[PDB]
Structure formats: structure tokens, C-alpha cells
């Protein structure tokens, strides 16, 4: 997250870190056994880390649970990033508490202008590289579909939205991928892609979670 703020420990209780020996992507806890992330974060050998603040220090509220299964969306296209969403099942259920909590799925799509909270452990610089140990947060609005398409000609599908600031300076970034965009207490987006980070006229692009609720629910119900 570039241009954001330190969230505070366990203030974003649905935020997960995906770990394969190291943090590599975010995710969102949607029930005691399932995490939603980006398909471009897929790899084997995932350990889900819940209850994290500093990802390099054991602070006392963590739960580390290996994944049993991952399910990339059936129509994910890694070239275009269309349908950039995946589900990860935990080998054992998380113990839910004030610091480790699910986030609700949307029951309708959010609108441009709605303020959302974007979070992660990704790079905090737009030129250059610095990776935080503690969770970072950014409040940002959803942008109109027409501004999004204009910013990224030929690249924005109906399964994507833009959020952020056209002036630059405030955005998600590498290492935030897979993490949450939460608006009014609902998971509306997944950190997906952008041109660089925090660049003028190049807002963040996010997977549009509301399009996937039926697939998520049906997949969980049978897996």
C-alpha cells in the first residue's frame, strides 16, 4: 500500500497473509474454513496466516493453518487477469474471535463514489521498494467504469473495477495482491493489478467480487 496508514494490530480481522515460506499475497477470510484471494496468487504449499499484524514477529493472536485445497476460478485468464479470483480451503477451521473474523460477501454490487478500505503488506513506495512488517491500510473510492476504461483502454472487463485516486500517490501495490477491498462491511474487491503503483492516471484495478457470489457459495457448499 502506497500513501496509506498503519492500520493498527488486528483492526482488519478478515485480512490474511498467504505464506509459502514468506508472505506473498493477501486474502480475505469469508468463513471459518475458506479464504478468497486472487487467482494470480495461486501456488501449491500455501499456509494461511490469520490474526497477523507484524508478519515477521509472533505477537500472540496468530493462527497458522495449512491449505487443503485451492480452487482457481473456472474462467480465469492469466493473460488478461479476467476472473482473477480463487478460493482456498483450510485444513482445519479457524477459531473465530474479535481479532480473527470473517467478512460478509456482498448482496449487490457497490457504486462508483463509495468509500472502501484496502489493506495489505505490499510495497509502500511507488518508485523503489520498501516492504512493511505491519499491516497498511488505505481509504479509497470506487471510480466510475467510464474513468476506469479510459485509464486502461482495452483492458477493463465487466469483472473488474478501478478504485483510488487519478492524481496518483495512493494505491495498492505488489504484495497486496489477493487482499481485500471492503465497502460498508462487505467484500467488494480483490487487489488484482495496475500499471506500476500510485501512478497518475493509473488507478488500482480490482476483481469485482459481487459477480462471483453465486460461484463462491456453490463452491463452498460442495467442497
Q: Give residues in contact with Ca ion (CB under 5 A).
A: 52, 54, 59
Is 176 annotated in the active site? no
Q: Which of 17, 28, 102, 177 is catalytic?
A: 177
- At residue 211, φ and ψ (nearest 5 deg) are -70, -15
Q: Work out how close the CB of 98 gets to Ca ion at its nearest, in angstroms, rounded to a whole number.
A: 17
Q: Work out how close the CB of 23 gets to Ca ion at its nearest, in angstroms, rounded to a whole number.
A: 10
Residue closer to Ca ion by CB (options 59, 145) is: 59
Residue closer to Ca ion by CB (options 50, 110) is: 50
Q: Could you tell me the end-to-end alpha-carbon distance of the chain, in angstroms, rounded to an integer? A: 33
Q: Work out how close the CB of 51 gets to Ca ion at its nearest, in angstroms, rounded to a whole number.
A: 8
- At residue 145, φ and ψ (nearest 5 deg) are -55, -40
Q: Which of 40, 102, 119, 176 is catalytic?
A: 40
DSSP track, 128-175 = S----SS-EEEEEEBPPHHHHHHHSTTT--TTEEEES-TTSS-B--TT
Give the integer Cα–Cα distance in Å for 173 and 24: 12
Residue closer to Ca ion by CB (options 58, 221) is: 58
Q: Which of 84, 102, 119, 192 is catalytic?
A: 84
Just list the catalytic residues: 40, 84, 177
Amino acid at each position: 500500500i502506497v500513501g496509506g496508514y498503519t492500520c493498527g494490530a488486528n483492526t482488519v480481522p478478515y485480512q490474511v497473509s498467504l505464506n509459502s515460506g514468506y508472505h506473498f499475497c493477501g486474502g480475505s477470510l469469508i468463513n471459518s474454513q475458506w479464504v478468497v484471494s486472487a487467482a494470480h496468487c495461486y501456488k501449491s504449499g500455501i499456509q494461511v496466516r490469520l490474526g497477523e499484524d507484524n508478519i515477521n514477529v509472533v505477537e500472540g493472536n496468530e493462527q497458522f493453518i495449512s491449505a487443503s485445497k485451492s480452487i482457481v476460478h473456472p474462467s480465469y485468464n492469466s493473460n488478461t487477469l479476467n476472473n482473477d479470483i480463487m478460493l482456498i480451503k483450510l485444513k482445519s477451521a479457524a477459531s473465530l474471535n474479535s481479532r480473527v473474523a470473517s467478512i460478509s460477501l456482498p448482496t449487490s454490487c457497490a457504486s462508483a463514489g463509495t468509500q472502501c478500505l484496502i489493506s495489505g503488506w505490499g510495497n509502500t513506495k511507488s518508485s523503489g521498494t520498501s516492504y512493511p512488517d505491519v499491516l497498511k491500510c488505505l481509504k479509497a473510492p470506487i471510480l466510475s467504469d467510464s474513468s476506469c476504461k479510459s485509464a486502461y483502454p482495452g483492458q477493463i472487463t465487466s469483472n473488474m473495477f478501478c478504485a483510488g485516486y487519478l492524481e496518483g500517490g495512493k494505491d495498492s501495490c505488489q504484495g497486496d495482491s489477493g487482499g481485500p477491498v471492503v465497502c460498508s462491511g462487505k467484500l467488494q474487491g480483490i487487489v488484482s493489478w495496475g500499471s506500476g503503483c500510485a501512478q497518475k492516471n493509473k488507478p488500482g484495478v480490482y476483481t469485482k467480487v459481487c459477480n462471483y457470489v453465486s460461484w463462491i457459495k456453490q463452491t463452498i457448499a460442495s467442497n
